[PDB]
Amino acid sequence: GPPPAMPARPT
Amino acid sequence: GSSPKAVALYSFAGEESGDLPFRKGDVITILKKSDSQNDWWTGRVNGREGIFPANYVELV
């Protein structure tokens, strides 16, 4: 499969 | 406890100057992490230090 969705960047 | 290093599962190019680019299979030294893989960690690889998506790596 494709590379996965990334997490939101850190605060 | 958590491994000192992780292996990249997928390539990551980065988008901004503080990001940490790598290719699948690269061995990253983890310098700062959290309990979550749905987060960004800090690592050293390929001559750079910076942040990257933690779901892109597997702890060794």
* Closest-CA residue to B40 (of A10, A1, A2): A10
The approach used to solve this structure was X-ray
Min Cα distance A2 → chain B (Å) is 9
Q: What are phi and psi of B49, to 5 degrees?
A: -125, 140
**Angstrom distance (rounded) from CA B30 to CA B14:** 17
Local structure of residue B55 (DSSP, 8 states): G
Which residues in chain B belong to E strands, given as ranges? 5-8, 27-32, 40-45, 48-53, 57-59
- This structure's resolution (Å) is 1.4
Asked if B37 and B55 touch (Cβ cutoff 8 Å), the reply is: yes
Cβ separation A3–B11 shorter than 8 A:
yes
CATH superfamily, with its number, for domain B1-60: SH3 Domains (2.30.30.40)
A10 touches chain B (CB under 8 A): yes
* Closest-CA residue to B5 (of B37, B34, B30, B40): B30
Name chain B contacts of A3, Cβ cutoff 8 Å: 10-11, 56
Domain ranges of chain B: 1-60
Name chain B contacts of A7, Cβ cutoff 8 Å: 38-40, 53-55
What are the helix (H) ranges across chain A?
none
Cβ neighbours of residue B7 under 8 Å, at least 6 residues apart?
A: B25, B26, B27, B28, B57, B58, B60
